[PDB]
Coordinates of C-alpha atoms and ligand atoms in Angstrom, one line a residue:
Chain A
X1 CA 211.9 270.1 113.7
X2 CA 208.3 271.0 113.7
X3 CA 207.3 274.7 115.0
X4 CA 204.3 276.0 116.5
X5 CA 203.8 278.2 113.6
X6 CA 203.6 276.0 111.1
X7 CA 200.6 275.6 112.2
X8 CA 197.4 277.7 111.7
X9 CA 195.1 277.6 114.6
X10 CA 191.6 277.3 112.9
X11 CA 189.2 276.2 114.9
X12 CA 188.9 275.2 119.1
X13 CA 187.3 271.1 118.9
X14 CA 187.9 270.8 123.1
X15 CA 189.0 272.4 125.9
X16 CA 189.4 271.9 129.5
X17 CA 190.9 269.3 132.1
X18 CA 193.1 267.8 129.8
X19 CA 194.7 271.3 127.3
X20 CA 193.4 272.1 124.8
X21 CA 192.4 270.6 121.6
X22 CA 192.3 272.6 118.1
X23 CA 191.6 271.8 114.6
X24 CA 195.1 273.0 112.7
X25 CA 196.5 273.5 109.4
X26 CA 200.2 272.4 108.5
X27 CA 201.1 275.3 106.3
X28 CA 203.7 272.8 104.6
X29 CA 201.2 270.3 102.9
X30 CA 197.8 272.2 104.1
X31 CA 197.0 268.6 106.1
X32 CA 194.5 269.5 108.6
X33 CA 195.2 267.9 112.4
X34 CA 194.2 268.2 116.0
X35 CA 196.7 269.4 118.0
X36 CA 196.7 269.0 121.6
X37 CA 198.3 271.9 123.6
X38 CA 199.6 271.2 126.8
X39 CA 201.0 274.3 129.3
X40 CA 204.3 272.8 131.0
X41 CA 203.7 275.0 133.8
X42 CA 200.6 272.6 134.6
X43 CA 201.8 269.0 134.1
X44 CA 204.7 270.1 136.5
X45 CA 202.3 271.6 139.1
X46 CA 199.9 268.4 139.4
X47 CA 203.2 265.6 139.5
X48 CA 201.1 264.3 136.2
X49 CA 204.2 264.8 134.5
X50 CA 204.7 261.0 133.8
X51 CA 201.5 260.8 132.0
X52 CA 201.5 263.1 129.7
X53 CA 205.1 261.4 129.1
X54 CA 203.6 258.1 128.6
X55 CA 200.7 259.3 126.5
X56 CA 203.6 260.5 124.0
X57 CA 205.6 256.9 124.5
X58 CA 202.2 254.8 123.9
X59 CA 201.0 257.4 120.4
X60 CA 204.8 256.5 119.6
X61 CA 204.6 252.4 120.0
X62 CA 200.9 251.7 118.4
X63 CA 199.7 251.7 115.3
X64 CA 196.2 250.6 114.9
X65 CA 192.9 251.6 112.9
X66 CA 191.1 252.3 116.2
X67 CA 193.7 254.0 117.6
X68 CA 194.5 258.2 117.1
X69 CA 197.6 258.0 115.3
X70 CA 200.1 261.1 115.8
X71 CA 202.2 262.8 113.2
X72 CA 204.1 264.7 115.2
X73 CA 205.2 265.6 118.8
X74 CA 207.7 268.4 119.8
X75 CA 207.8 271.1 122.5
X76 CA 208.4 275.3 123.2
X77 CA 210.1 277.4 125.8
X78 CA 206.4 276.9 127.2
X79 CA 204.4 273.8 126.0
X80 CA 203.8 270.1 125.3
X81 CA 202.4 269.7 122.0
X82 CA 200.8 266.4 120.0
X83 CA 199.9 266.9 116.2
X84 CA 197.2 264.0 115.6
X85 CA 194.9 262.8 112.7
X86 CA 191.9 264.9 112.9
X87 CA 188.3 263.1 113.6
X88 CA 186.1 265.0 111.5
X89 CA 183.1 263.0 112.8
X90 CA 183.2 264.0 116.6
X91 CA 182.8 261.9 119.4
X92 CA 179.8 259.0 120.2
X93 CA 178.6 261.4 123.0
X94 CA 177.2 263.8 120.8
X95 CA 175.8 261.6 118.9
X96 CA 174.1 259.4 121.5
X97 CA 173.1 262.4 123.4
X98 CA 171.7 263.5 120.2
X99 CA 170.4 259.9 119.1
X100 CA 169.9 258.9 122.7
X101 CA 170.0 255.4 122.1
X102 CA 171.6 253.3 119.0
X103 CA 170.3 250.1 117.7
X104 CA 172.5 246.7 118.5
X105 CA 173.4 246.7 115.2
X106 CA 175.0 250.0 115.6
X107 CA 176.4 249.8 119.1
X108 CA 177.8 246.1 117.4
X109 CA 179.8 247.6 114.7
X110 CA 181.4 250.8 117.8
X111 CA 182.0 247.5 120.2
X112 CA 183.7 245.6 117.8
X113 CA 186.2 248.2 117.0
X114 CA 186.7 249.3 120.6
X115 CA 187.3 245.9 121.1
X116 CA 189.8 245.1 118.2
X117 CA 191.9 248.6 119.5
X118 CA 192.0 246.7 122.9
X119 CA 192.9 243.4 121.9
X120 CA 195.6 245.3 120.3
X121 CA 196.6 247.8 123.3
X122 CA 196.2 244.6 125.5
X123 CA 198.7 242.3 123.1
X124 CA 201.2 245.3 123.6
X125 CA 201.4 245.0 127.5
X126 CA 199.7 248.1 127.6
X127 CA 196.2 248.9 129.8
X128 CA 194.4 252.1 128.6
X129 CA 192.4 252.8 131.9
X130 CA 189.9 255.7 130.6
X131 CA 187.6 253.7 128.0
X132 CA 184.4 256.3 127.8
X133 CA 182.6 258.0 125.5
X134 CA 183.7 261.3 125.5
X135 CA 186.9 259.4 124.5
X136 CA 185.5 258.0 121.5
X137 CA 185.7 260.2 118.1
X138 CA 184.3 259.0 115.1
X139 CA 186.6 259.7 111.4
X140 CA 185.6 261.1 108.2
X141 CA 184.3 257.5 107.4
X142 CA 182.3 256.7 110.4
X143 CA 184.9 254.4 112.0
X144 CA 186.1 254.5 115.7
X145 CA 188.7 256.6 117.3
X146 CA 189.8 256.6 121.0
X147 CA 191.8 259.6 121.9
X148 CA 193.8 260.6 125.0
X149 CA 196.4 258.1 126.3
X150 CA 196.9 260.1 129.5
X151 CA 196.3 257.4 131.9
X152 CA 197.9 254.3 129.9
X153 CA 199.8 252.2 131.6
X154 CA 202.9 250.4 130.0
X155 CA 204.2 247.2 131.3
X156 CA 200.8 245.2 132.1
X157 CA 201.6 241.6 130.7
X158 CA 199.2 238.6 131.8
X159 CA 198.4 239.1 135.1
X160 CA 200.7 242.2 136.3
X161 CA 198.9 244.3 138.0
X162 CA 198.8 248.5 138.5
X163 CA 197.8 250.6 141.8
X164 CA 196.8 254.0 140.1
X165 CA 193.5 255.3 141.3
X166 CA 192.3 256.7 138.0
X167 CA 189.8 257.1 135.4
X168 CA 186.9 258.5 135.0
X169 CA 184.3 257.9 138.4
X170 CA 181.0 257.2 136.7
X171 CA 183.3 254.4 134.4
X172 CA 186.0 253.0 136.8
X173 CA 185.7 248.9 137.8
X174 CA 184.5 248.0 141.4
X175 CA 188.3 246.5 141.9
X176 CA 189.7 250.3 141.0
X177 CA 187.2 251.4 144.1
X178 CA 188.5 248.9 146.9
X179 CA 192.4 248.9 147.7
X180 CA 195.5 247.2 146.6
X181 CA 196.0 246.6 143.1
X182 CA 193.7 245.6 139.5
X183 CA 194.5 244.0 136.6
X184 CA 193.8 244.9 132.4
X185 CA 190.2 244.0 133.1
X186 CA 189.3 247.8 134.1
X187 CA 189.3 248.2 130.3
X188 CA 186.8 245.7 129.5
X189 CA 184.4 247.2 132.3
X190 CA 184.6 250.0 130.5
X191 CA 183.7 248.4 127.3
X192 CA 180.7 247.6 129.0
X193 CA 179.3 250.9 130.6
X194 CA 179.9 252.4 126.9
X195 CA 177.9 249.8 125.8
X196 CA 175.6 249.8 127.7
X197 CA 174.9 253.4 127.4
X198 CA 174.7 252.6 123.6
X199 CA 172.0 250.4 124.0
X200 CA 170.4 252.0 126.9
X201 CA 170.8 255.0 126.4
X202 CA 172.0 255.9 129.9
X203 CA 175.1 255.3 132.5
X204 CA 174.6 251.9 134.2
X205 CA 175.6 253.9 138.1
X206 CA 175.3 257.7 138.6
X207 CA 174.8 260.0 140.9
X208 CA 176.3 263.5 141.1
X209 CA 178.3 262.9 144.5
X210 CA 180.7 260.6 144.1
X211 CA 180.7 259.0 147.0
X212 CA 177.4 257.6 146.4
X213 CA 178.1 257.0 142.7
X214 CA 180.9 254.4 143.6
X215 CA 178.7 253.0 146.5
X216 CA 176.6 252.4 143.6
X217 CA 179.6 250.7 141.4
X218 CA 180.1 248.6 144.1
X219 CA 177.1 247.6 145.0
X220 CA 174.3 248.3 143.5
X221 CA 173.3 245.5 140.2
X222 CA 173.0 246.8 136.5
X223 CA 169.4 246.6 135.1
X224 CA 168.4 246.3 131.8
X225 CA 165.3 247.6 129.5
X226 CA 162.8 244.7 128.9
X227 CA 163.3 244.8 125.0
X228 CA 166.9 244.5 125.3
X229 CA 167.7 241.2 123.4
X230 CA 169.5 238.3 125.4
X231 CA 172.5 238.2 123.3
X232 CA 172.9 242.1 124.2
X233 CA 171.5 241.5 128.1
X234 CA 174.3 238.4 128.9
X235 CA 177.1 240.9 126.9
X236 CA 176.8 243.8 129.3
X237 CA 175.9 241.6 132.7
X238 CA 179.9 239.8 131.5
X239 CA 181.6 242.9 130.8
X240 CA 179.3 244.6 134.1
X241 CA 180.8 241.8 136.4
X242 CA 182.0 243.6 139.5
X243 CA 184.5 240.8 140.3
X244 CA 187.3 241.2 137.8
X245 CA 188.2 237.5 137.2
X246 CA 184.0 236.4 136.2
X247 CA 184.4 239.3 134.2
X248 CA 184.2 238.5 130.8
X249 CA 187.3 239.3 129.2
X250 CA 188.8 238.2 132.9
X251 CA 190.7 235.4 132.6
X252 CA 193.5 234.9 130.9
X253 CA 192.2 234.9 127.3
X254 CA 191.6 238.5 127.6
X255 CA 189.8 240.0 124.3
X256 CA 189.0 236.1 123.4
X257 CA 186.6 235.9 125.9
X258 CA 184.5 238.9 124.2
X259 CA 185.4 238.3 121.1
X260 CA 183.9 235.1 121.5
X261 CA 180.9 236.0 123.1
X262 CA 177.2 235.5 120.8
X263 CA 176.3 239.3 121.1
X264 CA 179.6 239.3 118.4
X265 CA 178.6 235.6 116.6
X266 CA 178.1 238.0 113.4
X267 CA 181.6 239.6 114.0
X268 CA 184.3 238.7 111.3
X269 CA 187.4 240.1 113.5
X270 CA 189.8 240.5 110.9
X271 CA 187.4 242.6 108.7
X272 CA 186.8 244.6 111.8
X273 CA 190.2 245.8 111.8
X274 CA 190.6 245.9 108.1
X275 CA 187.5 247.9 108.1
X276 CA 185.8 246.3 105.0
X277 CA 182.4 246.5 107.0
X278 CA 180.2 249.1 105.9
X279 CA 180.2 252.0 109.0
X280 CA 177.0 252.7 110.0
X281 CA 176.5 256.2 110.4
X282 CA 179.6 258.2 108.4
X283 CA 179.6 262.4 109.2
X284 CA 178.7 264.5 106.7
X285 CA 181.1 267.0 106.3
X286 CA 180.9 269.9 103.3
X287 CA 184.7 271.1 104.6
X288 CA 187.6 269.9 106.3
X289 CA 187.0 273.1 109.0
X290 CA 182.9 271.4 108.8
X291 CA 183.0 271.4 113.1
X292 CA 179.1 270.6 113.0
X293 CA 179.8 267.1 114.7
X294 CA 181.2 269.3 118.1
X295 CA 179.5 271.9 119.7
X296 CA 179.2 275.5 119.1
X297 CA 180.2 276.1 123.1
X298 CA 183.9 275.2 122.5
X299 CA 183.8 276.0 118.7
X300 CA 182.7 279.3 118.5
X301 CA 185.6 281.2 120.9
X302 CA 189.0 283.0 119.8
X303 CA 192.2 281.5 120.2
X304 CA 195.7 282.4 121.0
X305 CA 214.9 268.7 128.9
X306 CA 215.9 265.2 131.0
X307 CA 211.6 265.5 132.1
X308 CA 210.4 265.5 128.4
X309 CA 213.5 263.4 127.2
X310 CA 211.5 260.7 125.0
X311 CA 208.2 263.2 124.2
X312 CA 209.4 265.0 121.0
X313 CA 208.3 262.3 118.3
X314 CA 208.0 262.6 114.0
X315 CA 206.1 259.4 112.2
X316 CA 207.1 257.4 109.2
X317 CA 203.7 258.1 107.9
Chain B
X1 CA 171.8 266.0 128.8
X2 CA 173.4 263.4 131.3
X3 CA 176.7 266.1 132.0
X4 CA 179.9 265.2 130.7
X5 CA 182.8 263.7 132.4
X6 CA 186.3 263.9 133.9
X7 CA 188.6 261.5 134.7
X8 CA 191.5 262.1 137.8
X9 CA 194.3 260.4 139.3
X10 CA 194.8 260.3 142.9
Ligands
L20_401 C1 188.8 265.6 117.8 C2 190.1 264.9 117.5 N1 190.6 264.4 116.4 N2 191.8 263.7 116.6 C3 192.1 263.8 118.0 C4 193.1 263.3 118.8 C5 193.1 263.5 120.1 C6 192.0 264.2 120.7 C7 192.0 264.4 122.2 C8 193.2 264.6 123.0 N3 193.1 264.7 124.3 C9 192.0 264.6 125.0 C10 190.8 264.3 124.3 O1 189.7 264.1 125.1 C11 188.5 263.5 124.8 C12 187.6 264.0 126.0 N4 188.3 263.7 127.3 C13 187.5 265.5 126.0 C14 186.7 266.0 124.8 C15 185.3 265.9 124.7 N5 184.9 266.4 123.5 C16 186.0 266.8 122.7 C17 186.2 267.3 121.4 C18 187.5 267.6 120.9 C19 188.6 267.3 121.7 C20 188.5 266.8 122.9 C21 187.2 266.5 123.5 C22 190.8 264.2 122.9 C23 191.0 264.7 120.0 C24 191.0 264.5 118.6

């Protein structure tokens, strides 16, 4: 058994919809992790009970470079709680924001890995549904990590199909917008709009109200900055398909398709995942509590079963 | 800025 308090609570990395997100110290060995502090009270209230199961199931089952590995998962007389390797390096949104655009090269080396992690998820029947910046943390090396599992889905072999409307609305696939069901192609859309704001520097479809924002989704057609090379250009008008099966990384090949794809040509997949390429950018940390690479908003405040059956979790690691 | 986003489930 783990316990809250071995834990110090050091410093708040993110906060909001999801919990609450803070840098930790395991008093034991000193390790330093992000813990992720759910309130029972609120999974309960919103039915989102099965999510924030199946986050803990899918952390449990995958083990992957790309992916956030956990340590630990247990519970209190009050809360859900995941103990996670800590991203030192902060997510691509502050850094594009920051940045506002990268080179190809660059956006290249953060596609390849996203796409390696959902090659991987994919091979494991599993569809991750929320691919966006924000979700993307960089490590102490420079390398991806996508964080928050919350709207996985399990079970999603081949074609199978899921009827969830979720996601994120300025990143969800013009199939998620009509009705009936989608397929694991959602996730390569979303490989595209983060791409695309990696190389363009801004969201493909936006508008404030929503409604209009997926009447844009639907129907509105990407456009691209003049300099954008053709190799980068034909990537994100694939992955930016509206119709799931021209998508590329729509049939049933799945990652193949994208993997195959010239914008990669210079792409050595396996040295992707055994991360022997040079990252392009790595964080430059003087600490382990160095919380430059988030902002000083969130970082600067104080801080203080039959349903959860299969959540409590401790890794081999 | 571009604002930062929030994903749901209906
Ligand atoms: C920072 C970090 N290191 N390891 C992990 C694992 C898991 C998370 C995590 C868990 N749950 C939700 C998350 O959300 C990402 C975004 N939806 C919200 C967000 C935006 N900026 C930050 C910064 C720090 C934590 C969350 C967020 C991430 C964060 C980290």
């Amino acid at each position: 058994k783990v316990t809250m308090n071995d834990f110090d609570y050091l410093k708040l990395l993110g906060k909001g919809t999801f919990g609450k997100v803070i840098l930790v110290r395991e008093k034991a060995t000193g390790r330093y992790y992000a813990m992720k502090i759910l309130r029972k009270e609120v999974i309960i209230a919103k039915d989102e009970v099965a999510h924030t199961v199946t986050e803990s199931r899918v952390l449990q089952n995958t083990r992957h470079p790309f992916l956030t590995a956990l340590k630990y998962a247990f519970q209190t007389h009050d809360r859900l709680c995941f103990v996670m390797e800590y991203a030192n390096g902060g997510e691509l949104f502050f850094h594009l924001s920051r940045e506002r655009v990268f080179t190809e090269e660059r956006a290249r080396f953060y596609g390849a890995e996203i796409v390696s992690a959902l090659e991987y998820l994919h091979s494991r029947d599993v569809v991750y549904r929320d691919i966006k910046l924000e979700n993307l943390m960089l490590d102490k090396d420079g390398h991806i990590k996508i964080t928050d599992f919350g709207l996985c889905k399990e079970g999603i072999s081949d074609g199978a199909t899921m009827k969830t409307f979720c996601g994120t609305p300025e990143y969800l696939a013009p199939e998620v917008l009509e009705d009936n069901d989608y397929g694991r192609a959602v996730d390569w859309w979303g490989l595209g709009v983060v791409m695309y704001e990696m190389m363009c520097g801004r969201l493909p479809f936006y508008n404030q109200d929503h409604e209009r924002l997926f009447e844009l989704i639907l129907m509105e057609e990407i456009r691209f900055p003049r300099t954008l090379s053709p190799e980068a250009k034909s990537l994100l008008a694939g992955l930016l398909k509206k119709d799931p099966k021209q998508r590329l990384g729509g049939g049933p090949s799945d990652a193949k398709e994208v993997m195959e794809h010239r914008f990669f040509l210079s792409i050595n997949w396996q040295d992707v995942v055994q991360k022997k390429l040079l990252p392009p950018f790595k964080p430059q940390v003087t600490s382990e509590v160095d919380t430059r690479y988030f902002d000083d908003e969130f970082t600067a405040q104080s801080i203080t079963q039959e349903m959860f059956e299969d959540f409590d979790y401790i890794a081999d690691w | 800025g571009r604002p930062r986003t929030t994903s749901f489930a209906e």
